[PDB]
Curated annotation (Swiss-Prot), chain A:
This protein is one of the early assembly proteins of the 50S ribosomal subunit, although it is not seen to bind rRNA by itself. It is important during the early stages of 50S assembly. Part of the 50S ribosomal subunit. The lineage of its organism: Bacteria, Thermotogati, Deinococcota, Deinococci, Thermales. GO terms for molecular function: mRNA binding; structural constituent of ribosome. PROSITE patterns: RIBOSOMAL_L13. It comes from Thermus thermophilus (strain ATCC BAA-163 / DSM 7039 / HB27). This is Large ribosomal subunit protein uL13. CDD domains: Ribosomal_L13. Keywords: Ribonucleoprotein, Ribosomal protein.
Curated annotation (Swiss-Prot), chain B:
GO terms for biological process: translation. It comes from Thermus thermophilus (strain ATCC BAA-163 / DSM 7039 / HB27). SUPFAM superfamilies: Ribosomal protein L22. This protein binds specifically to 23S rRNA; its binding is stimulated by other ribosomal proteins, e.g. L4, L17, and L20. It is important during the early stages of 50S assembly. It makes multiple contacts with different domains of the 23S rRNA in the assembled 50S subunit and ribosome. This is Large ribosomal subunit protein uL22.
From Swiss-Prot, chain C:
One of its GO terms (molecular function) is rRNA binding. NCBIfam families: rplT_bact. It comes from Thermus thermophilus (strain ATCC BAA-163 / DSM 7039 / HB27). Keywords: Ribonucleoprotein, Ribosomal protein, RNA-binding, rRNA-binding. Belongs to the bacterial ribosomal protein bL20 family. GO terms for cellular component: ribonucleoprotein complex; ribosome. This is Large ribosomal subunit protein bL20.
From Swiss-Prot, chain E:
Found on the solvent side of the large subunit. Belongs to the bacterial ribosomal protein bL32 family. Residues 1-22 have a biased composition (Basic residues). GO terms for biological process: translation. SUPFAM superfamilies: Zn-binding ribosomal proteins. GO terms for molecular function: structural constituent of ribosome. This is Large ribosomal subunit protein bL32. Residues 1-27 are annotated as: Disordered. It comes from Thermus thermophilus (strain ATCC BAA-163 / DSM 7039 / HB27). One of its GO terms (cellular component) is large ribosomal subunit.
Length: 138, 113, 117, 156, 59
RNA sequence: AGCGGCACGCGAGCUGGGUUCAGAACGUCGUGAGACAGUUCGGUCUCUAUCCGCCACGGGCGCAGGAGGCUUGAGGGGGGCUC
RNA sequence: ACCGGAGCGCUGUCUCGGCGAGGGACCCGGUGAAAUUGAACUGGCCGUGAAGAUGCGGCCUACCCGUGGCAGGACGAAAAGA
RNA sequence: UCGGGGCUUAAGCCCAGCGCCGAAGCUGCGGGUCUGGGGGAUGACCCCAGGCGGUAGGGGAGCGUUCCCGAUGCCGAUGAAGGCCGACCCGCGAGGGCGGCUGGAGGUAAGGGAAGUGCGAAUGCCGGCAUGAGUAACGAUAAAGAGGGUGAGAAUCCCUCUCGC
RNA sequence: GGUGAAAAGAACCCCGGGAGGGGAGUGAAAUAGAGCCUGAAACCGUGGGCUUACAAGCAGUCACGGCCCCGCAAGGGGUUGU
């Protein structure tokens, strides 16, 4: 025969917690969902993996000293442009990042790996734009 | 019908006249006429004249009435190249090329019914 | 005996050129660049055949795993059962029953966890 | 060879800081009109072949034609006074169609006068009755004397 | 033929683009009042003219 | 009045004074031509930047109505002295 | 018109550079070469690699193309290394 | 910066059980090939077993080209040789047939033979067209400005005035 | 080196300073048009099919998707989002 090709599938939204979950353990799952890898109809080259909006990120938990320890680096092309912000302050200002980040490096990278990150919309809250389905999960 | 007039075996390098042509490429006789009157490249003279002779065929030969006359294909294809020598010192006779081109305006008529 | 070659070479080069005709860059009209590019292309073809094998093996196994968890649990178990049952195939290829007709699948799932779950 | 050019024998370029290649005369092969390499020369191919062996050749070949039943010893061709039409009528009468060539082995020159012109009749004579022509042709139309030639030829 | 020398050929497409921002350029004309032809803007036409139109001695 | 790295940073950026070209001499070794981490005087750094990179500047498209006008700060750069 | 040392006056040599000049550079039109050139679709870090990479891994910044300008790199061009 | 990530009863370290992955290795299906063996007198052709990474290099076979024997012949104006086009056929291949377009008179089977025979390279030889680049330059910084005239066409030629070296 | 069997080698009108072209007309053929038989490629043009303005590359390979043109079907060629 010849293995099957899902036609234009509908984009199923979801929603996951945040608060209480361990930062990394979360994405691990979350990731998989952004791609079709949970779906019994996954396909590499199409991105039909679930739009994961997330609620109250600001209360993400994580282990050890990572609160203080963990360092979020950023380097402009300008010599000496290396700016390293800690997980700590990173919670305090725009905490949503920390998730989106832990995440954004659990995808692959070719032009769609980033298309998929657009398929993700966390907030520190809860709240979101109640657009549709978004059936809660666990 | 259509009206053929080529400019075979003519001085000046392509690039220049290739540039001249594409400006007027596919337009009215009246239009392009007024364009050529006010464009600043010796091509202006050349293209204008060969275009006028392209219209001249459509007058006394094929006939499509001057009113209806619109411009199709004008291509300008390179010919050979004039080979001369250049006064560069230190013992080297450089080579220089005065190119030659082929402006080919074909202006047909308005309607097709 | 003028052993003048003739055009022979031009014809051969025409062949390999036609072989490469399409590629980006002068390597599509350069009957030597076309040759090198072509070389790459062919070795590529071979490697990409055996790689095609394990590629599609994999993709099959992917949807198989995800759907396996969708019903009961993990692919590893699933198969382990199917093997310690007697299902001397399932045909990883056509293990993709999960794709079309999930009933069949879930039945084989029952048979899987039955086998030695 | 490359040696015979009405040209130089003096290097056109330096041999180092030229920037160009590294050669010399325009009589080398790699250039334009420069000569060839080991080829076009006046060479005779001829060789030596043992007597009896090639003799047997004739024998065998001629004898093979006797297996192919096309031969005869006409004591006299009635085409007396070398005219084409005479020996032509004689050919028709003796059983000579018009589509089988004539290694016409025989000896009288007047006979072969007609045969000196027939275009499906090479006209082979006896003093040089050869195997090659025997193969390319058809008719041992020998006079007794031509057979005496073929006879004295063997001698073993 | 000195220090700066193109290191490897320039590809056709590149030539094209260098000349993409090149290419020829349109003229622009204006109607001539008290007359019937085209002129450059604010200029005078030897066939048309400005106010009063000085010259206009075309044979 | 710090030490060090980056081809002991930097000659398609400069200098060429030092350096190991051909002259000559000097002290010097060699029967000698010449030679000597021994010295001395002089002595031609090659206009045109293809790609990258850097600094300024535009053209096209963009932003899932079309125009003006006023903004927000993601990120990044500068500024941090001292008697 | 040969190589040091000094001193006076003098001075854009310097502190330290600022304007000005015309002529080139830049925009309009006419003409229009060169070396070099495997093909290019050519950012960076950090490792590697026959030991100094846009091409390899990991991992990188940034729409597409141009004009003027500088010169770190393409182990830059010219020298089948003195 | 452990590749990364991210992990803190661990996604770390240790130790035990089972499972799955994952190589072109191996199993299967099919065609080739090579060595041995066997049927077949049987050449052909089929069954069986075992080898088939590979530079220099040693062995075997074949495609093709230029000319000759074949040629007082065979092919061809209803069309030779190249040339251009191809998603058909044959051969593992190099090629061969086919067909469409072009072209205008040579070409040569089956069997043999004779060789200046097969190009990607040698800062290789000639010839051709590009690359940079519509860029550098367009020869002295003594200098040009206007009127009329010729003409299809005047900065660039000629008559006059003006300037300057 | 070579028009063509033969010069029959282009009168005339047309635009244009000419240059060169557009018919007329020449011949079997002017896509034999005058250093012209036959017109490979590099080579620069022009029209149309596909694709390209969040985009990391020895440039193709392999598969999936879509766009155009084929094909009676099933199949195919061309293209490239991934």
């Amino acid at each position: 025969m010849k293995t099957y090709v899902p036609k234009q599938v509908e984009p199923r939204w979801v929603l996951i917690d945040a608060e209480g979950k361990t930062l990394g353990r979360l994405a691990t799952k979350i990731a998989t969902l952004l791609r079709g890898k949970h779906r019994p109809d996954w396909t590499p080259n199409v991105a039909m993996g679930d739009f994961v909006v997330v609620v109250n990120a600001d209360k993400i938990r994580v282990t050890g000293k990572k609160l203080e320890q963990k360092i979020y680096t950023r380097y402009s092309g300008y010599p000496g442009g290396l700016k390293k912000i800690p997980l700590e302050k990173m919670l305090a200002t725009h905490p949503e990042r920390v998730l989106e980040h832990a995440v954004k490096g659990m995808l692959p990278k070719g032009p769609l790996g980033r298309r998929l990150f657009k398929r993700l919309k966390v907030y520190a809250g809860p709240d979101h734009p109640h657009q549709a389905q978004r059936p809660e999960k666990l | 019908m259509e009206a053929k007039a080529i400019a075979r075996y003519v001085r000046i390098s392509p690039r220049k006249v290739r540039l001249v042509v594409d400006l007027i490429r596919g337009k009215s006789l009246e239009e392009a006429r007024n364009i050529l009157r006010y464009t600043n490249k010796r091509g202006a003279y050349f293209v204008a004249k060969v275009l006028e002779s392209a219209a001249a065929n459509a007058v006394n030969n094929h006939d499509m009435l001057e009113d209806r006359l619109y411009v199709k294909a004008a291509y300008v294809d390179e010919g050979p190249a004039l080979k001369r020598v250049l006064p560069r010192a230190r013992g080297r006779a450089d080579i220089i090329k005065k190119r030659t081109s082929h402006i080919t305006v074909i202006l047909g008529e308005k309607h097709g019914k | 005996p003028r052993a003048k070659t003739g055009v022979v070479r031009r014809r051969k080069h025409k062949k390999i050129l036609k072989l490469a005709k399409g590629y980006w860059g002068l390597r599509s009209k350069s009957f030597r660049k076309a040759r090198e590019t072509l070389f790459a292309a062919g070795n590529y073809a071979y490697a990409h055949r055996k790689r095609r094998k394990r590629d599609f093996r994999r993709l099959w196994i992917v949807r198989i795993n995800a759907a396996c968890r969708q019903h009961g649990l993990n692919y590893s178990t699933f198969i382990h059962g199917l093997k310690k049952a007697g299902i001397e195939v399932d045909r990883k290829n056509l293990a993709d029953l999960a794709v079309r007709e999930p009933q069949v699948f879930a039945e084989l799932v029952e048979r899987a966890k039955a086998a030695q779950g | 060879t490359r040696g015979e050019v009405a040209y130089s024998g003096r290097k056109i370029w330096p041999q180092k800081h030229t920037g160009r290649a590294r050669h010399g005369d325009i009589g080398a092969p790699i250039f334009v009109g420069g000569g060839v390499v080991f080829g076009p020369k006046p060479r005779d191919y001829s060789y030596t072949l043992p007597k009896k062996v090639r003799k047997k050749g004739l024998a065998m070949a001629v004898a093979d034609r006797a297996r192919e039943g096309k031969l005869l010893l006409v004591e006299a061709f009635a085409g007396v006074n070398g005219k084409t039409k005479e020996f032509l009528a004689w050919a028709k009468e003796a059983g000579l169609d018009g589509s089988e060539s004539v290694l016409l082995v025989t000896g009288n020159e007047l006979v072969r006068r007609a045969a000196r012109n027939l275009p499906w009749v090479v006209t082979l004579a006896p003093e040089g009755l050869n195997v090659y022509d025997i193969v390319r042709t058809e008719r041992l139309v020998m006079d007794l004397d031509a057979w005496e030639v073929f006879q004295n030829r063997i001698g073993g | 033929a000195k220090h700066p020398v193109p290191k490897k050929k320039t590809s056709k497409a590149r030539r094209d683009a260098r000349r993409s921002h090149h290419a020829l350029t349109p003229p622009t004309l204006v109607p001539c009042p008290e007359c019937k032809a085209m002129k450059p803007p604010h200029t005078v036409c030897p066939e048309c003219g400005y106010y009063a139109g000085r010259k206009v001695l075309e044979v």
